[PDB]
Structure 1
Amino acid sequence: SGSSEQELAAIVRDLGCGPYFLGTHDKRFPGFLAGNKLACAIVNTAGRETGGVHWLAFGWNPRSRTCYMFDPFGFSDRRLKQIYSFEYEAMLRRSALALSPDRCLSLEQSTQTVQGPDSAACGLFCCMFLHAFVHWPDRPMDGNPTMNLLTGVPNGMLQSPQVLPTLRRNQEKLYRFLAHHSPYFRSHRAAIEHATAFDKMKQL
């Protein structure tokens, strides 16, 4: 059920983010403070103490003063607070004060889901975005070889029967990606695909 920090760190190193990755974290991820460098991270919405709820990806682009928040569901800030109790202003504030000369940044976030409502692949979609990020940090959400393979649909449509095929097709290809790109995936494919299944939530 879900995906573990060990398994996403493995998959993220396999994707080439080794030189830029800051580890997976609970909601208390300190941010990007170490220095002004291409850095990205995977961040849970809850604390470690909850045993884990939802995976997000974060990236900092030094060339463009931009932090990307990636939720495979593409929820709004409000909907992030609401459903997951997750906020990340503390984290952005620490990152701006540290790296931004003018204490300002661009926060760029998804407005669409690539994830089915009952899928438990969030962690993995995060991996995928991070690959895209670490290769195309200027254009990571869309318009690059990696994210091109996914098909965004408006987050407002997450629960609608019209886009289920679409979010499923998204999962199958994600699996193909990670298959093609990650030795740690191929070695534990059968398992990760069972634990992260397109409708894991129905079969708990």
Structure 2
Amino acid sequence: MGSSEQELKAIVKDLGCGPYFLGTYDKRFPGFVSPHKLACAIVNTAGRETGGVHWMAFAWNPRSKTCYLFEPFGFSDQRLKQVYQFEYESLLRRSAIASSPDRCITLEKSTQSVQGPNSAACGLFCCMFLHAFANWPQTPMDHNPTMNLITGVPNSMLNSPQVQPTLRRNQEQLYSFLERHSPYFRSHSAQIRSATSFCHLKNM
């Protein structure tokens, strides 16, 4: 809906990921059946019946046979299972089986947070990473023009009133990056920012 509708597609499209974008999915995403092309997808932690709770990105580099998992909070698999009841165990298996000769795969997932605890900007952070992936499929997590704009923070420090200013800045940079490269974002700024604000989910 407002906090990133399934129109991360429009933005993803604007960012030039079109030739690699499989689309938006819910927890049921099967995996990658693409042993020859770069593919990427924005997956939700929940089933469509629920409406969606957390957006995350998956990317596949057949050349290096590595699968990228970018979930904005950098949560451990243990905490992913707990907080969101999500597991990407079957999709990895499928992906190795369907896309790799030796049925092996290297998983590379972020271990740091770039998003604030009360922020509803997850879907947007995924689009920014997919831009990084499309342009630098060998080093998308860091060390590239796009991701150098934001700073990762050890997950244990997510709620620390100390790194909060780094996390709000990250989001300022997010918004401006989309502003620069996305006609759709530009023509929808007020709506998107307000729908995905840094403090959007703060308790009252």
TM range (shorter): over 0.9
2:173 maps to: 173
Distance change >3 Å, CA 34–CA 94, structure 1 → 2: same
Residue type matched to 1:16 in 2? Answer: G
Kindly provide the CA deviation profile for residues 82-138 of structure 1, in whole angstroms up to 9, marking residues without a partner as x: 100010111111110001111111100011000000000000000000000010010
2:127 maps to: 127
Segments of 5+ residues of structure 2 without an aligned counterpart are none
2:112 maps to: 112
Is 1:138 the equivalent of 2:158?
no
| CA distance in structure 2 between the partners assigned to 1:61 and 1:34 by the alignment | 9
1:160 maps to: 160
1:3 maps to: 4
Shift of 1:170: 0.3
1:58 maps to: 58
Secondary structure at 1:30 match in 2: coil
Map 1:1-204 → 2, pairs under 5 A: 1-5=2-6, 7-202=7-202
Instruction: Give the paired residue count.
Output: 203
Residue type matched to 1:2 in 2? Answer: S
Question: Residue 75 of structure 2 contacts residue 155 of structure 2 at CA under 8 Å; is this kept in 1?
Answer: yes
Residue type matched to 1:138 in 2? Answer: Q
Shift of 1:55: 0.3
| CA distance in structure 2 between the partners assigned to 1:18 and 1:101 by the alignment | 27
Residue type matched to 2:114 in 1? Answer: V
Kindly provide the CA deviation profile for residues 8-30 of structure 1, in whole angstroms up to 9, marking residues without a partner as x: 00000101000000000001111
| CA distance in structure 1 between the partners assigned to 2:165 and 2:34 by the alignment | 42
Distance change >3 Å, CA 203–CA 189, structure 1 → 2: farther
- Which stretch has the larger CA shift, 33-42 or 177-186? 33-42
Secondary structure at 1:200 match in 2: coil
Shift of 1:168: 0.1
Tell me the TM-score normalised to structure 1 length.
0.97
Residue type matched to 2:99 in 1? Answer: L
Shift of 1:63: 1.3
| CA distance in structure 1 between the partners assigned to 2:80 and 2:183 by the alignment | 33
Shift of 1:35: 4.4
Secondary structure at 2:197 match in 1: coil
Q: Find runs of 4+ consecutive structure 1 residues off by over 3 angstroms.
A: none
Secondary structure at 1:201 match in 2: coil
Segments of 5+ residues of structure 1 without an aligned counterpart are none
Secondary structure at 1:57 match in 2: strand
Bigger helix fraction: 1
- Which stretch has the larger CA shift, 34-43 or 90-99? 34-43
Tell me the TM-score normalised to structure 2 length.
0.97
| CA distance in structure 2 between the partners assigned to 1:133 and 1:41 by the alignment | 11
Shift of 1:36: 2.5
| CA distance in structure 1 between the partners assigned to 2:5 and 2:186 by the alignment | 16
Shift of 1:31: 1.1
